[PDB]
Amino acid sequence: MNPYERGPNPTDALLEARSGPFSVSEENVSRLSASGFGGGTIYYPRENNTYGAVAISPGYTGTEASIAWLGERIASHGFVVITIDTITTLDQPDSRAEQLNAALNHMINRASSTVRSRIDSSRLAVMGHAMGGGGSLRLASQRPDLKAAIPLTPWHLNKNWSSVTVPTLIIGADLDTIAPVATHAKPFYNSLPSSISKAYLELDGATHFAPNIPNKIIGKYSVAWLKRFVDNDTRYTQFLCPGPRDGLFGEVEEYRSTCPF
């Protein structure tokens, strides 16, 4: 009925497991072969089919190695995913937005036929850690056509994202001292329009490095957000609405959303 649906009916366990049901292979993108970004790695399902496609940026001073687990994990749930390196490790968020865009174009137009043939170029998403999460917000602002955006403990000097209409899940870390939720993640969420699909998920007992460490909660809700909005997979609505509990015995520090979507 939904021909974008991939993989079996989800459960909390299946979404929290280290890997989804899709076996993954990798395509290396050298710095030489990459135009407008610093290279990286494309994770893609071996099983032949078309899938949504996602570009993920690391943060300030970091490289693809700090987000690799996420590229692999998301790809194993039926997506084509590039973890990029940036032209330099010091690139600012809005430069990171340009490089994410170049990485989307690389996957669609310049990668091998194996990778290009597994991408539905009409169904794209963007994600990033810290400064790359700020890059996610900027690119979502510049490309309303993106299907989803997921800034992870994002950092950005601009606090006004009222131009974004892409379905956006922001993930904050309560103990983040680099991009404190009070001055980055939450102001971002609050400046997004009340009229779009969005969610704020704040992790309990998590620092700025949490998205760099394999994380059941990040893995679960990133994939659920991507499934719901990249694939239009309403089987995943059950995890986003009402969403993880932030109350007594709950799983998150805070969850807020514009459910129903």
Ligand X SMILES: O=C(O)c1ccc(C(=O)OCCO)cc1
Q: Note the residues at the interface with ligand X (CB under 6 A).
A: 58-62, 66, 129-131, 155, 178
Nearer to ligand X, 6 or 129 (CB): 129
Tokens of 38: 């610093």
Nearer to ligand X, 123 or 186 (CB): 186
Distances (CA, A) of 256 to 144, 190, 253: 22, 10, 10
* Least separation in angstroms between CB 89 and ligand X: 9
Nearer to ligand X, 151 or 167 (CB): 151
* Least separation in angstroms between CB 248 and ligand X: 33
Q: Which residue is nearest to ligand X (CB)?
A: 59
* Least separation in angstroms between CB 76 and ligand X: 23
Say how far apart CA 66 and CA 174 lie, in whole Å: 20
Nearer to ligand X, 74 or 130 (CB): 130
* Least separation in angstroms between CB 180 and ligand X: 11
Tokens of 75: 């790809």
* Least separation in angstroms between CB 177 and ligand X: 9
Nearer to ligand X, 40 or 59 (CB): 59
Q: Determine the distance from the C-alpha atom of residue 90 to the mean position of all C-alpha atoms in its chain, rounded to a whole number.
A: 21
